[PDB]
Amino acid sequence: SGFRKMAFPSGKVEGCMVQVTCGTTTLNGLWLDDVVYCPRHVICTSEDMLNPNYEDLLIRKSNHNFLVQAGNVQLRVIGHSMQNCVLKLKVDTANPKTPKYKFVRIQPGQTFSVLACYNGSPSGVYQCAMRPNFTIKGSFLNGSCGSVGFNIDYDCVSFCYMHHMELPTGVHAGTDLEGNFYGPFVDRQTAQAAGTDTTITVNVLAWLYAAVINGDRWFLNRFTTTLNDFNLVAMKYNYEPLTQDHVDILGPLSAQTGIAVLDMCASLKELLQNGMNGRTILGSALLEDEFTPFDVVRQCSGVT
Amino acid sequence: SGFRKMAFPSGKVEGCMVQVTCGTTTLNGLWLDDVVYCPRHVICTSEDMLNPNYEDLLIRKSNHNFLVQAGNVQLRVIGHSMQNCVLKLKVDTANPKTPKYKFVRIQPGQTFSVLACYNGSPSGVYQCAMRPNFTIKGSFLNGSCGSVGFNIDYDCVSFCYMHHMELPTGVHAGTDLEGNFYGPFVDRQTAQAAGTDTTITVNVLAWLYAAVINGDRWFLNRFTTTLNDFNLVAMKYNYEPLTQDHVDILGPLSAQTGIAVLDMCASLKELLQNGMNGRTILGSALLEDEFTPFDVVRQCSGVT
Numbered sequence: 001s002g003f004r005k006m007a008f009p010s011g012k013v014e015g016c017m018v019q020v021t022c023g024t025t026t027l028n029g030l031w032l033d034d035v036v037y038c039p040r041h042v043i044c045t046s047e048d049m050l051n052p053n054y055e056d057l058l059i060r061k062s063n064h065n066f067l068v069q070a071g072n073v074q075l076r077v078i079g080h081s082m083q084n085c086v087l088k089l090k091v092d093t094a095n096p097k098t099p100k101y102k103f104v105r106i107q108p109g110q111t112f113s114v115l116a117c118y119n120g121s122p123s124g125v126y127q128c129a130m131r132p133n134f135t136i137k138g139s140f141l142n143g144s145c146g147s148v149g150f151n152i153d154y155d156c157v158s159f160c161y162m163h164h165m166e167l168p169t170g171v172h173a174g175t176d177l178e179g180n181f182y183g184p185f186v187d188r189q190t191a192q193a194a195g196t197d198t199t200i201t202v203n204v205l206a207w208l209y210a211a212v213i214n215g216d217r218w219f220l221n222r223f224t225t226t227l228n229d230f231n232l233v234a235m236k237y238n239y240e241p242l243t244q245d246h247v248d249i250l251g252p253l254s255a256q257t258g259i260a261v262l263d264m265c266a267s268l269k270e271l272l273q274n275g276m277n278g279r280t281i282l283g284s285a286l287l288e289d290e291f292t293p294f295d296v297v298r299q300c301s302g303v304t
Numbered sequence: 305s306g307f308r309k310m311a312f313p314s315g316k317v318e319g320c321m322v323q324v325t326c327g328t329t330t331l332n333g334l335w336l337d338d339v340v341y342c343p344r345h346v347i348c349t350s351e352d353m354l355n356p357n358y359e360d361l362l363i364r365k366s367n368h369n370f371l372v373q374a375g376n377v378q379l380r381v382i383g384h385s386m387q388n389c390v391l392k393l394k395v396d397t398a399n400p401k402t403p404k405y406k407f408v409r410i411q412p413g414q415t416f417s418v419l420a421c422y423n424g425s426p427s428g429v430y431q432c433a434m435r436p437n438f439t440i441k442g443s444f445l446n447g448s449c450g451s452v453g454f455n456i457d458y459d460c461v462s463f464c465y466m467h468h469m470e471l472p473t474g475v476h477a478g479t480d481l482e483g484n485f486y487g488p489f490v491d492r493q494t495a496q497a498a499g500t501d502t503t504i505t506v507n508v509l510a511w512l513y514a515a516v517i518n519g520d521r522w523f524l525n526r527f528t529t530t531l532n533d534f535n536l537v538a539m540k541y542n543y544e545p546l547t548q549d550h551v552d553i554l555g556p557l558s559a560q561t562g563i564a565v566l567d568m569c570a571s572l573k574e575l576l577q578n579g580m581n582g583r584t585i586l587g588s589a590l591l592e593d594e595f596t597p598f599d600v601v602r603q604c605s606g607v608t
């Protein structure tokens with residue numbers, strides 16, 4: 001038993017990380033077969049930051065303006081292109097460590113692992129959710145751009161996030177690996193704001209199932225409610241509305257515990273309305289919303 | 305900015321995980337050069353559990369009673385010995401992915417990453433602390449024995465933990481890679497109990513500095529204290545006493561924030577006595593004690 005903030009093993013991704021330098025500017029890139037993907041603002045300076053003319057910047061740059069290093073050894077760039085907000089550097093060497101992969105766009109409320117990297121070298125791996133406002137509550141410093149988020153489905157790495165920027169509220173924003181931002185953000189230094197964040201209800205329910213599987217059951221009573229009555233309560237605490245699709249995906253956890261989803265909803269309604277009464281659940285004194293139902297199934301059943 | 309429960313990149317360790325089977329019992333081993341390390345209770349059965357006679361069980365077995373698999377390739381066993389509570393199986397081929405490594409014995413309060421594995425295949429990575437009572441609060445299911453904990457000192461993997469068992473209180477116990485248990489535990493299925501657990505004070509203080517670096521300051525007060533007076537408060541709330549060495553280890557975070565350690569001690573003292581009164585710190589409503597001072601520096605400075 002036990003329940004931890006658990007990331008995917010990062011080995012497959014670690015072998016794909018490189019550093020990409022253009023002039024004075026260095027960040028991280030992802031080396032898959034003979035292509036390196038990185039944020040296109042590697043070709044910018046601060047003179048360009050408000051209205052960068054990316055096509056002009058790139059056409060002034062040539063294959064030799066790009067320095068790509070894997071570990072500490074240089075790869076030769078032999079071609080460059082731009083796809084939305086991502087640069088695609090064709091290199092002379094295919095990466096022999098390339099895993100089976102897919103580029104995916106995740107949905108808000110879903111989770112991924114983040115390999116945080118600096119100068120092409122991995123620093124650490126943590127678990128993040130895509131917030132309903134299309135930001136992530138990451139841990140990133142200067143130099144971390146180009147770090148990627150991913151899930152592992154079977155033996156395929158599904159890359160879903162590339163890091164670009166930090167908003168002044170301390171939250172982070174970036175693109176999928178096709179270069180399109182999550183949310184209403186652009187890679188220019190205009191003042192940008194995320195909408196008001198909400199709590200991811202289905203994940204809270206998932207984590208309360210994780211608590212029952214692990215023996216923390218004090219909040220469980222033989223209570224139940226309806227979907228509509230739960231949602232009237234949820235919006236009062238800025239929880240996202242629970243749909244019957246959310247109910248269905250909690251099926252596996254309900255199946256293993258014998259607690260019907262709307263019974264756990266009744267428990268959650270009682271926690272929002274009465275508080276936690278100084279108690280903890282799974283070591284936390286707050287309701288946690290960054291474990292999906294799949295996350296719970298995976299580590300409460302040992303998927304490998 | 306930001307702050308996450310961050311684990312080390314696990315790639316170097318993933319390349320060391322194998323499956324070890326003895327009879328119908330299967331768990332994980334660690335393959336380094338031409339030796340595989342795994343818990344010795346792989347050679348047991350149900351009747352043995354109360355008081356396994358391991359020397360008898362081991363001497364009676366032949367190398368052919370041990371099935372070691374690295375992915376889908378057998379490693380032939382050519383020797384089988386015991387060091388304390390770990391079995392060492394000599395195999396015919398050295399691991400081509402053997403990293404630079406050391407076996408280290410860590411102290412209570414230190415953190416490490418855990419690569420949870422099943423049937424020799426990595427499932428996930430998370431961060432743990434060695435509790436003052438020499439247990440850990442991990443996430444382990446049946447089949448996870450032989451999973452290892454580790455730190456990375458630049459390029460050297462410092463293996464510090466191998467997983468053996470779960471106590472009935474929900475916590476976990478194991479050995480170092482020389483086979484010696486942490487704490488007073490033994491690998492017999494007998495009523496065993498950890499001493500009273502305590503909070504790791506120096507770690508909470510480190511996490512308060514991480515909060516300040518991320519702009520949470522509401523809990524700061526103007527008072528300073530002495531180490532002697534603070535330690536009287538720590539004893540009252542079953543916090544570990546703070547040593548001058550702990551103070552000095554916090555020095556890099558004091559250097560970054562300009563807040564003296566004994567001023568931050570006075571802030572913690574008020575938090576212990578009166579709690580947080582509805583407020584949060586780094587998105588938590590509890591004092592977190594599983595980030596060491598170095599963990600914080602590594603995230604609030606970007607060490608790779």
Ligand SMILES: *[C@@H](CC(=O)OCC)[C@H](C[C@@H]1CCNC1=O)NC(=O)[C@H](Cc1ccccc1)NC(=O)[C@@H](Cc1ccc(F)cc1)NC(=O)CCOCC#C
Pocket residue numbers: 025026027028041049140141142143144145146164165166167168172186187188189190191192193305
């Ligand atoms: C990655 C850049 C890099 O590695 O290459 C340069 C050597 C960094 C990642 C951040 C640094 C701090 N925390 C991070 O996550 N990205 C930036 O520095 C970007 C560059 C940029 C991207 C898109 C559009 C314009 C510029 N800048 C920022 O993140 C800045 C500026 C900004 C604010 C709001 C917004 F919508 C776009 C850009 N962010 C801040 O300065 C907020 C303060 O917190 C960060 C710090 C310290």
Ligand SMILES: *[C@@H](CC(=O)OCC)[C@H](C[C@@H]1CCNC1=O)NC(=O)[C@H](Cc1ccccc1)NC(=O)[C@@H](Cc1ccc(F)cc1)NC(=O)CCOCC#C
Pocket residue numbers: 001329330331332345353444445446447448449450467468469470471472476489490491492493494495496497
């Ligand atoms: C790893 C063994 C394995 O992989 O075997 C392959 C067939 C497991 C890891 C645990 C499974 C449950 N939670 C875990 O962390 N280890 C065990 O199953 C050990 C085997 C054992 C090791 C040393 C000495 C005796 C037996 N048994 C347990 O962990 C049991 C029994 C026990 C309790 C207290 C104590 F001090 C020693 C051994 N623990 C429990 O039954 C309580 C937890 O129940 C959760 C379940 C299932």
